[PDB]
Write a sequence for this structure.
């Protein structure tokens, strides 16, 4: 149980489908077409057991604007461990892989965490954002209050004032 | 399995060791006759580097990084091609074709479209492979809101993957430091 990293373009149709179905099941169905689209394009950390995917996390590239700078961010999407495999720290192995990618390629990692996972991210050195969050929408900056309190960041090569504004870039569905 | 000689190899930025990273940076900077800034280098990072090796040196490079391009209010998932370069002593042998086979493979497997802003000398190379010239006005979604990027008009090319785009429409890239396209 060490995770393997595979870019989206290296997944065959069968594997891509196994991943989407496992993740959707792990979120008990609370996983939409846009949530799935948000897991695509970057590196997937995958753990298998007998040809079955039992754990997944994806890290995709985007920009987060902090103090006027568009920081190169590794954004974590779709972190999930199959229900019958929970409580064995498989998530720790997924994050070891995701974090290795962030140290090698990004200025910071970030994600919008489900409440049950917040203790886990904090224990690993992720920081909860306290300042107001926004998104740079096509019409300009728009606050995203529904996502306040869910965003976490992992600084790699920058010290951060986590009470400053933080503004993610645009996409469909949930922007955070 | 043959030797894989001059087949481009795809390596994520996080998997580049410092020696390879330095070799890519100096090779690409030299290929652009030095017109390759600190921000142009930052723009090649975070995605997949297609690398061609010869005697332990990088003789060709192209990076595909992920960003969003906004088309008709839609945020398209885009593989953006940066730093396309073939070291000067190896030019004229179609190695850029080997780089683009890998780049295009990445687009079909992971993005809604590939895009890039081409130097004038390479516009015909991309067009011959099926990349479409973007005819409409380009802009960027800067922190203050949309703003036109006329200097970049006529340089952008796209490779749609199973989506249909009206290439005469406005196309707006997302924000970053330096050249936004
Ligand atoms: C959050 C999640 C990835 C954790 O994966 P994991 O590998 O099971 O994590 P851990 O083993 O460290 O367990 C985390 C907690 O889950 C709980 N847990 C233990 N066994 C469990 C089980 N059999 N079923 C469900 N939850 C269980 C415990 O509270 C545990 O905390 P502890 O370390 O103090 O015991 C997983 O629960 C999951 O996929 N949940 C649904 C999707 C989700 O919210 N993903 C996160 C999005 S940010
Ligand atoms: C653009 C580039 C990647 C093409 O690489 P390549 O593998 O040499 O491509 P090709 O073999 O198909 O040659 C392209 C053209 O370059 C020209 N060429 C041939 N030999 C050349 C040489 N030794 N030196 C420079 N240009 C040469 C020819 O016009 C050739 O076209 P042709 O096949 O119709 O005769 C390369 O010229 C380069 O790195 N240029 C500098 C950086 C830059 O502009 N890159 C593109 C950024 S979008
Ligand atoms: N519902 C699937 C999504 O869940 C998590 O992300 C969301 C996050 O968690 C989901 O919401 C449920 C209630 O907290 C929680 O139970 C979550 O369902 C949510 O609180 C934020 N407001 C928006 C985040 N995008 C994951 N980080 C995200 O990758 C995934 O696509
Ligand atoms: N100067 C280095 C950059 O060049 C190419 O891209 C630029 C592109 O080409 C550079 O400009 C020279 C003249 O066209 C050409 O000689 C080019 O120098 C330029 O025309 C666009 N206005 C902006 C593009 N970012 C590459 N696509 C880009 O990846 C690289 O970072
Ligand atoms: N009325 C409720 N019934 C059941 N669970 C709820 C209720 N309202 C909110 N929740 C859940 O309880 C959590 C509430 O989220 P909050 O962001 O308010 O954080 P909190 O638990 O630290 O107070 C969520 O769990 P999840 O993110 O792990 O999925 C949310 O789903």
């Amino acid at each position: 149980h060490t995770a393997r990293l595979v870019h989206t373009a290296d997944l065959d149709s069968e594997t891509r489908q196994d991943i989407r179905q496992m993740v959707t099941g792990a979120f008990a169905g609370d996983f939409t077409e846009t949530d799935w689209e948000h897991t695509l394009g970057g590196m997937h950390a995958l753990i298998w057991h007998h040809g079955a995917i039992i754990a997944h996390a994806a890290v995709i590239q985007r920009r987060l604007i902090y103090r006027g700078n568009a920081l190169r961010c590794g954004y974590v999407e779709g972190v999930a461990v199959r229900a019958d495999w929970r409580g064995q720290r498989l998530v720790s192995a997924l994050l070891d892989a995701v974090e290795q990618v962030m140290r090698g390629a990004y200025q910071l990692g970030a994600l919008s965490s489900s409440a049950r996972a917040r203790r886990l991210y904090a224990s690993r050195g992720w920081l909860p954002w306290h300042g107001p969050t926004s998104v740079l929408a096509p019409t300009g900056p728009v606050r995203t209050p529904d996502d306040d309190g869910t965003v976490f960041v992992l600084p790699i090569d920058i010290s951060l004032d986590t009470s400053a504004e933080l503004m993610c870039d645009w996409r469909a569905g949930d922007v955070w």
Notes: Strands of chain B lie at 9-12, 48-54, 57-71, 74-86, 113-117, 132-133, 138-142, 145-148, 156-160, 171-173. Chain B touches chain A at residues 10, 12-16, 42, 45-48, 65-68, 70, 73-75, 77, 79, 105-111, 141, 143-146, 172, 174-177 (CB under 8 Å). The pocket of coenzyme A (ligand 2) is lined by residues B 31-32, 84-86, 88, 91-96, 118-119, 121-122, 125 (CB under 6 Å). Chain B has one domain: 1-181.
